Amino acid sequence: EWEKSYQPPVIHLGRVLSVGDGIARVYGLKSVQAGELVCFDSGVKGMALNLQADHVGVVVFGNDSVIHQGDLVYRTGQIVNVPIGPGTLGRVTDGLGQPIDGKGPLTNVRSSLVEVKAPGIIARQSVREPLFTGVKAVDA
Amino acid sequence: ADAKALDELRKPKFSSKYLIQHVSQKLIPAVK
Amino acid sequence: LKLPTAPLQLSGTSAQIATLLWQVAAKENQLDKVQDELYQFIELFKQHSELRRLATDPFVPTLVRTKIISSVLKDSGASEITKKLFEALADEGALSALLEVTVNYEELMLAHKKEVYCTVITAEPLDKLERVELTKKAEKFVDAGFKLVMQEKIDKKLLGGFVIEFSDRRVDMSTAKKVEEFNNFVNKLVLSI
Amino acid sequence: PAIDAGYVSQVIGPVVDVRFDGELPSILSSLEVEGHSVRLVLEVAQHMGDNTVRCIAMDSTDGLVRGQKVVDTGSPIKVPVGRGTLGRIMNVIGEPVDEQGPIDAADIWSIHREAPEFTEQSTEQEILVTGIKVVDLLAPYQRGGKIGLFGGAGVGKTVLIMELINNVAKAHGGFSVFAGVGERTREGNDLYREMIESGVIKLGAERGNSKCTLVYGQMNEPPGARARVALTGLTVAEYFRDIEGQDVLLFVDNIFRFTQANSEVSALLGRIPSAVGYQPTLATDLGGLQERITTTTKGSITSVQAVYVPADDLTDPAPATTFAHLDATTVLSRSIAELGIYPAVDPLDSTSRMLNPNVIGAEHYNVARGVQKVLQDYKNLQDIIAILGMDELSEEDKLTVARARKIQRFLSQPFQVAEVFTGTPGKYVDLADTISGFQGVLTGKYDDLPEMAFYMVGDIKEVKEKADKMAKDIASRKEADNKKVSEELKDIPSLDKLVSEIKEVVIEEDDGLEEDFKAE
Ligand SMILES: Nc1ncnc2c1ncn2[C@@H]1O[C@H](COP(=O)(O)OP(=O)(O)O)[C@@H](O)[C@H]1O
Ligand SMILES: [Mg+2]
């Protein structure tokens, strides 16, 4: 059923104009979203921060020494997300959700956005049940 | 803008020469 | 006032010249005329050094720049839009912008003829039926009745199929990405099962 | 759909440049983005010059593409106002966020208007008795005036605003509008639930007998929303003042967040920054907002606004500009809170225009000036008391020090809204009780009591009650420990009788997390 439903998605390209000071200016990506996770061809991710009229300001999640002027920036199509779920329990991840403990990929997990609006006035209730820290200076 | 479309303007693409052969007949007295 | 709308919106102060140059040449129906007239100056700036002195040298007076461009373009039957264009740029010293107006006049002309220059990379050169299969398969990626103009290249590292390089975006319909995406899907499905 | 529909030109955080092909929107007019995840409303800030407007988004711009069609509403942000807004919650664009259905709108008003003119101003100085001793004595509030609570980061200017709600708003008769600008969402939910319990906000069929409208722009909102929710709450108050023509209360928690949200936006509107890092248009933005919160000839707005101070610095331009727009200033300081004196009002930095002998009377003004003279004379003695010791002043100096340490403790008071985390009952003090008690401490009738007799009491009767309550305590030593617990006959069971009653709980076998993650 995967192979009968298989569509090679039109990858949107974009050259790098200017990199340095931890931020790349990216030509192209005319359909990119504000706050979208873009992926450089060096494998280092980025976030489309400032959508300008003539370029896209991309802050680079990683060392920007691997980015050159003329590198290709593929957009991933989604706002900056991390894998969330019970498969993260026990795992040491970096700031983008990729595991750094070397225990393989995060199985049993699902990507969700890191920039979510906090729940509103009618979504809360009062804090009733306690959370015991095990420090008796604190819990008393 | 871009660069890769702008490198292609290094190639001759004029497809008519009623100006390039006219201006050299009138540029040099005008600048002299 | 009442001008025909540009085929696509563009950037600032150099494409805004080319948008306005397209918007007045469309009311004159001289779109292909001045696109030929802009191209002739680009070879003209390639020939003479005393002409591209008027665009780079900051010591020519702004009177001598606007007189020489008029004293050359009295004649030759150049369109009255371009001889009004070059007097606008010579008064402001924006003669250097012509190389950037022309590349912004091009894609306005390209989106008026609704053509899009793509590049096809296949494993073997095509048939004359494989081309008409490929054209209607690649016509699902443009957003209107665009006349697709293909180019053909060969990469045998692809094991059959094609990729399209639209110079904005790329679609990889090759069997190489198909088999590696297949193996990724299989090796990630047995990661769970 | 060609004209009156522009497209997103560029997106710089909360600042969206929208390009129109012709017939641009006016400044302050609201626009709508088509096909966003939530309703995204932009509000035009500038005409950038090349058929481009520059807007501020009232929600998050995450997910905008630079081609998205933006329709123009032809009007500024228009929120519902009227009596059908009472007992509801609104956000910055007037949408209900209480899940009680649509807001029944007596009118749909724009949130932008000019200040009332000079001839509509009313000069009427009547006092507002708050029940708080330091407020009623040293900086009395005007009934119909602008009140500011200054202080930074945990000094108590939300507990002061809730005590002012609890005292003034319950005994008011008019309507109230709480505009929560840039505050905690926990606090807004606390106020909403506490106002449901008090009947100030009623739900459902008897909703129209509510006495409060909440407009919440809390600190999880993007800087376009916090910069404009005070205007929405102001419009809901302005309708009751102008059209219904009655006296209302406007409680704005952290009007500093309006200034801060404009300071966040204005870095991206392409401006040279002003002093400490704020926008160049600080004073005029703050002024044009504050000059609408006035008493006029057609109605009254009693405005209580908490003002945050950054880094406990009053010389910061956002508090220093707010100082001029207020009639009563209540400066809460951190060191007075660290002394345990709550409400932590600095009595030598809080002022009022009602502290005038022609407004509050002669003995009230004289008692207030005498308390401030004792406190200033004690503040001038702080260095030598610190480095030489108390034992080297003159006798009148160390009488001044004792009376000042008495009136510092006596200015503190237990709050009825703080009785859930203190344990002391709250003490509403009448104004005459405050004047009489402080005249008693000033003349010298109470040089005999201890200092801690004055700490956290209502009035001058309760200092004597607490004096005998704490001098019977040093005599409180009773005989034989009064046991009656040694072998109580069949009242205290054994331990295994008591473990025989406690229920067994079931421990559900390694957290069950993968079985319900695959449920979706
Ligand atoms: N009136 C008060 N009486 C006693 N404690 C207070 C009082 N006001 C504030 N506090 C203490 O200080 C904290 C800050 O109160 P709050 O009014 O929320 O301050 P802010 O809003 O300025 O941060 C409270 O949680 C409490 O511990
Ligand atoms: Mg607070």
| HEC per residue, D359-422 | CCCHHHHHHHHHHHHHHHHHHCCHHHHHHCCHHHCCHHHHHHHHHHHHHHHHCCCCCCCCCCCC
CA distance D254 to D232: 15
Q: Is D157 in the pocket of ligand 1 (CB under 6 A)?
A: yes
Q: Is D154 in the pocket of ligand 1 (CB under 6 A)?
A: yes
CA distance C174 to C182: 12
Residues of C in contact with A11 (CB under 8 A): 169-172
CATH code assigned at D239? 3.40.50.300
Residues of A in contact with B6 (CB under 8 A): none
CB D506: neighbour CB atoms within 10 A? 5
D14 and D98 in a single domain? The answer is no
Confirm if D85 and D105 have CB atoms less than 8 A apart: yes
CA distance C179 to D5: 45
Nearest to D332 by CA among D356, D307, D354, D352: D307
CATH code assigned at D59? 2.40.10.170
Q: Where are the alpha helices (DSSP H) in D76-130?
A: none
Residue with token string 């991390």: A82
* Coil, helix or strand at residue D292: coil
Q: Do chains A and C meet with 3 or more Cβ pairs nearer than 8 Å?
A: yes
CA distance D128 to B17: 90
Confirm if D168 and D243 have CB atoms less than 8 A apart: no
CA distance D335 to D346: 9
Structural domain range at position D303: 77-354
The vertex-D156 CA angle with D152 and D157, nearest 5°, equals: 75
Interface test with D, best of A121, A124, A128 (most D CBs within 10 A): A121
Domain contains D502: no
State the distance from the centre of ligand 1 to the C-alpha of D162, rounded, in angstroms: 10
Residue C112 exposed, middle or buried by CB count within 10 Å (0-12, 13-18, 19+): middle
* Number of separate domains in chain D: 3
The vertex-D214 CA angle with D212 and D218, nearest 5°, equals: 155
The b/e string for C69-103 (b: 16+ C-beta within 10 A; e otherwise) is beebbeebebeebbbebbeebbeeebbebbbbbbb
End residue of a domain, out of D338, D354, D370: D354
Distances (CA, A) of D165 to A123, C32, D138, D253, D353: 24, 74, 20, 12, 22
| Resolution value (Å, 1 decimal) | 3.3
Domain contains D116: yes
Q: Which two tokens stand for residue D371?
A: 């308390």
Tell me the CB-side half-sphere exposure of residue C94, using CA atoms within 13 A.
16
D178 and D262 in a single domain? The answer is yes
Say how far residue A45 (Cα) sits from the centre of its chain.
8
Nearest to A8 by CA among C142, C150, C164: C164
Is residue D54 part of the annotated active site? The answer reads no
Confirm if D299 and D175 have CB atoms less than 8 A apart: no
Q: Where are the alpha helices (DSSP H) in D131-281?
A: 133-138, 159-168, 185-197, 223-226, 229-242, 256-265
Q: Which amino acid is at A54?
A: D
Residue with token string 């939530």: D38
Nearest protein CA to atom 10 of ligand 1, as residue: D156
D384 and D346 in a single domain? The answer is no
Tell me the CB-side half-sphere exposure of residue C20, using CA atoms within 13 A.
13
Which residues contact residue D349 at a Cβ distance below 8 angstroms, ignoring those fewer than 6 apart? D314, D329, D331, D333
Structural domain range at position A29: 11-80
Q: Which two tokens stand for residue A137?
A: 């200076």
For a pocket test of ligand 1, which of D159, D186, D413 has the largest count of ligand atoms closer than 8 A to its C-beta? D159
CA distance D135 to D352: 9
D325 and D372 in a single domain? The answer is no
A72 Cβ under 8 Å from any chain B Cβ: no
CATH code assigned at A33? 2.40.30.20
Residues of B in contact with C67 (CB under 8 A): 30
Confirm if D262 and D181 have CB atoms less than 8 A apart: no
D8 and D84 in a single domain? The answer is no
Atom of ligand 1 nearest to the CA of D183: 21
Nearest to C12 by CA among D12, D10, D269, B8: D10
Confirm if D307 and D53 have CB atoms less than 8 A apart: no
CA distance D465 to D451: 13
Number of A/B CB contacts below 8 angstroms equals 5
| D214, β-bridge pairs | D89, D178
* Coil, helix or strand at residue D332: strand
Q: Which two tokens stand for residue D107?
A: 């009118």
Q: Is D308 in the pocket of ligand 1 (CB under 6 A)?
A: no
Q: Which two tokens stand for residue D224?
A: 């376009």
**D342 annotated ligand binder:** yes
List the determination method.
Answer: cryo-EM
Q: Which amino acid is at D234?
A: L
Torsion of CA D420, D425, D429, D435, to 10 degrees: -110
Task: Specify the pairing of strand A36-40 against strand D41-47.
Answer: unpaired
Confirm if D257 and D226 have CB atoms less than 8 A apart: yes
Atom of ligand 1 nearest to the CA of D162: 17
Q: Which two tokens stand for residue A26?
A: 């990216």
Residue D497 exposed, middle or buried by CB count within 10 Å (0-12, 13-18, 19+): exposed
D360 and D349 in a single domain? The answer is no
* Cβ–Cβ gap B30/C78 under 8 Å: no
Nearest protein CA to atom 4 of ligand 1, as residue: D342
CA distance D450 to D166: 31
Could you say which DSSP state residue D296 is in? B
Task: Specify the pairing of strand A81-84 against strand A110-113.
Answer: antiparallel
A45 Cβ under 8 Å from any chain B Cβ: no
Q: Among B5, B15, B27, select the one facing C39 at the smallest CB separation.
A: B15
Q: Which two tokens stand for residue A86?
A: 């019970």
Torsion of CA C127, C133, C135, C139, to 10 degrees: -170
Terminal CA-CA length for chain C:
66
Phi/psi region, residue D94 (left: phi>0; alpha: psi -120 to 50; beta: rest), is: left
Give the residue from chain C lying closest to B24, CA to CA. Answer: C48
Backbone angles phi, psi at C53, to 5 degrees: -65, -30
Torsion of CA D260, D265, D270, D271, to 10 degrees: -20
Domain contains D345: yes
DSSP run (H or E) holding D142: strand D141-142
The b/e string for D23-53 (b: 16+ C-beta within 10 A; e otherwise) is ebbeeebbbebeebeeebbbbbbbebeebbb
Q: Among C36, C50, C100, select the one facing B15 at the smallest CB separation.
A: C36
CA distance C178 to C184: 10
Confirm if D434 and D459 have CB atoms less than 8 A apart: yes
Say how far residue D382 (Cα) sits from the centre of its chain.
32
Q: Please spell the DSSP secondary structure of A98-134, one letter per residue.
A: -B-SSS-S--S-EEEES--PPP-TTT-----S----S
CA distance C186 to C193: 10
Distances (CA, A) of D28 to A124, D111, D334: 33, 10, 39
Could you say which DSSP state residue D231 is in? H
Confirm if D44 and D25 have CB atoms less than 8 A apart: yes
Q: Where are the alpha helices (DSSP H) in chain C?
A: 15-27, 31-47, 49-56, 62-72, 82-92, 98-110, 128-138, 175-189
Could you say which DSSP state residue A33 is in? P
Q: Which amino acid is at C150?
A: M
D118 and D226 in a single domain? The answer is yes
D420 and D281 in a single domain? The answer is no
D84 and D65 in a single domain? The answer is no
D213 and D294 in a single domain? The answer is yes
Distances (CA, A) of D278 to D43, D169, D229, D257, D266: 21, 34, 19, 12, 8
CA distance C52 to D87: 73
Nearest to C33 by CA among C42, C22, C43: C22
The b/e string for D216-251 (b: 16+ C-beta within 10 A; e otherwise) is bbbbebbbbbbbbbbbbbbbbbbbbbbbbeebbbbb
Is residue D497 part of the annotated active site? The answer reads no
Distances (CA, A) of D392 to A4, D384, D396, D398: 96, 8, 12, 9
CATH code assigned at D364? 1.10.1140.10
CA distance D181 to D214: 11
Radius of gyration of chain C (CA): 24
D195 and D288 in a single domain? The answer is yes
D244 and D342 in a single domain? The answer is yes
Confirm if C10 and C18 have CB atoms less than 8 A apart: yes
Q: Which two tokens stand for residue A5?
A: 């439903």
Residues with CB in 5 Å of ion ligand 2: D 158
Chain B neighbours (≥3 Cβ pairs under 8 A) are A, C
Which residues contact residue D496 at a Cβ distance below 8 angstroms, ignoring those fewer than 6 apart? none
Domain contains D373: yes
C182 Cβ under 8 Å from any chain A Cβ: yes
CB C4: neighbour CB atoms within 10 A? 12
Backbone angles phi, psi at D76, to 5 degrees: -75, -175
Residue D274 exposed, middle or buried by CB count within 10 Å (0-12, 13-18, 19+): middle
Terminal CA-CA length for chain B:
35
Q: Is D135 in the pocket of ligand 1 (CB under 6 A)?
A: no
**How big is chain A, counted in residues?**
140
Is residue D183 part of the annotated active site? The answer reads yes
Nearest to A71 by CA among A113, A40, A39: A40
The b/e string for C20-41 (b: 16+ C-beta within 10 A; e otherwise) is ebbeebbeeebbebbbbbbbbb
End residue of a domain, out of D47, D76, D105: D76
Residues of A in contact with B4 (CB under 8 A): 15
CA distance D180 to D171: 22
**D299 annotated ligand binder:** no
| C121, β-bridge pairs | C153, C163
CB D310: neighbour CB atoms within 10 A? 15
